[PDB]
């Protein structure tokens, strides 16, 4: 995240997707065995290349010695053509906790009110020297679609300040609160620029594929 701030605690639904022992991009935990992330995040098809890291504040896990969990990627389930969505299945299931927790998903079809305050988290490009490795967050506001196309029913518009998610933050969640419940409403996919001010980001609307997600969870069984 460019022009964010470091989180004070480690966010519980955040997953560091590790590609060849390097953090490639982000991912949000939604079930004990299921992670939701973006298509652009899997260059290879060999499952042994990937791990998933949970319960970490630091991307190398330095701080969080008593809370990290490393899980192997059992299977990739690919979203519909055009979704840029990938539901990741884990070999052994995540052990839920204070440092590891699920994030709720929105009702199917919902339109989230404009000006709703939201957030993006990720261990990606800071734009600065000496990235302390600590998870970062930027504060966004839902906006109108016309404010972005200068849109499909699978995309939402959110902007700030000149900040946002960048490379390394992809497949991470857009998180919003309504009626005192935080859900994951978008998922970070590469937009035109990085943190360009007055240029809101495009996120793939989780609420548009939310029914798809349950079709998978009900179908692809876990050992």
């Amino acid at each position: 995240v460019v022009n964010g701030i470091p989180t004070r605690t480690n966010i519980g639904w955040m997953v560091s997707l590790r590609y060849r022992n390097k953090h490639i991009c982000g991912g949000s935990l939604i079930k004990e065995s299921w992670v939701l992330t973006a298509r652009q995040c899997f260059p290879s098809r060999d499952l042994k290349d990937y791990e998933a890291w949970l319960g970490i504040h630091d991307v190398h896990g330095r701080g969080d010695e008593k809370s990290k969990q490393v899980l192997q990627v059992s299977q990739l389930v690919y979203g519909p053509e055009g979704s840029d969505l990938v539901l990741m299945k884990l070999a052994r299931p995540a052990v839920l906790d204070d440092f590891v927790s699920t994030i709720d998903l929105p009702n199917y079809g919902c339109t989230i009110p404009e000006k709703t305050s939201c957030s993006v988290y990720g261990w990606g490009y800071t734009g600065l020297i000496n990235y302390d490795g600590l998870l970062r967050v930027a504060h966004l506001y839902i906006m109108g679609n016309e404010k972005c196309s200068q849109l499909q029913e699978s995309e939402i518009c959110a902007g700030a300040i000149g900040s946002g998610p960048c490379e390394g933050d992809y497949g991470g969640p857009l998180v919003c609160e309504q009626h005192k419940m935080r859900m994951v409403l978008g998922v970070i996919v590469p937009g035109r620029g990085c943190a360009i001010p007055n240029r809101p980001g495009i996120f793939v609307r989780v609420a548009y594929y939310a029914k798809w997600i349950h079709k998978i969870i009900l179908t692809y069984k876990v050992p």
Partner: antibody, heavy 121, light 108 residues
Framework: QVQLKESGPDLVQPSQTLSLTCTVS????????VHWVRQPPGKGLEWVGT???????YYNSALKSRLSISRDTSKNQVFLKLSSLETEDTAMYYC???????????????WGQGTSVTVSS | DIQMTQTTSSLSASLGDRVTFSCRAS??????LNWYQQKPDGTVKLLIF???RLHSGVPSRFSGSGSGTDYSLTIANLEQEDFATYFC?????????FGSGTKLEIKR
């Protein structure tokens, strides 16, 4: 909207135990933390302590041995308790909210109006 | 205990002045410093979180600036409502601590 109000007594006596209650609305104590701050008459603000979104408790250093904080998520309230009261605990007591998990900072971004609390015999 | 020193107790100014307040920490706080406004009726508002980030409702004439131990807050184009007391506070280590405050009075 985010609201907080403080509501305990306004006159208690030395060696007693103060019991304040913070009644929140608009957010859920599960995704947000609450902070107590006091202000002796005429002085600047003093941090009292905090209850985090995950029920972790941190206390002001001079007060910690007679302080306590608790919460009922169903009753939307956070409870302050200060044992063995001194005259010098006379102060306005506010309660405040975090950024919680949505905003992930520890700054107090919403503030109660306060409630006066006086200690003497 | 991290000691936030705020050396100036009051500071007199007039409408339209650029006015600055500052804190000095007893140790490196790494930009974990916040600023609040206490109005004469005792109302407290959050002005700035992190060293420089501006809160959602705060009118745009406020800004932040600092690093390490020395942080500061300024108001360009001072307006009448801005006459209040300004407090800083560190988030580096528990327990959070405040500064003695700076009361902004009106010059005469």
């Amino acid at each position: 909207q985010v609201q907080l109000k403080e509501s305990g007594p306004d006159l208690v006596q030395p060696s007693q135990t103060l019991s304040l209650t913070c009644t929140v609305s608009g957010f859920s104590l599960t995704g947000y933390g609450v902070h107590w701050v006091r202000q002796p008459p005429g002085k600047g603000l003093e941090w009292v302590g905090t209850l985090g979104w995950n029920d972790k408790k941190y206390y002001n250093s001079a007060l910690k041995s007679r302080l306590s904080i608790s919460r009922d998520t169903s009753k939307n309230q956070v409870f302050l308790k200060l044992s063995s009261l001194e005259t010098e605990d006379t102060a306005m007591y506010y309660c405040t909210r975090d950024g919680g998990l949505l905003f992930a900072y520890y700054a107090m971004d919403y503030w109660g109006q306060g409630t006066s609390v006086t200690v003497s015999s | 205990d991290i000691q936030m020193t705020q050396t100036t107790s009051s500071l007199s100014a007039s409408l339209g002045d650029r006015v600055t307040f500052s804190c000095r920490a007893s140790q490196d706080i790494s930009n974990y410093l916040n600023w609040y406004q206490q109005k004469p009726d005792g109302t407290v508002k959050l002005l700035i979180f992190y060293t420089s980030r501006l809160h959602s409702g705060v009118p745009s004439r406020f800004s932040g600036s600092g690093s390490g131990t020395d942080y500061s807050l300024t108001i360009a184009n001072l307006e009448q409502e801005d006459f209040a007391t300004y407090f800083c506070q560190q988030d580096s280590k528990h327990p959070f601590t405040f500064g003695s405050g700076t009361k902004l009075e009106i010059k005469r």
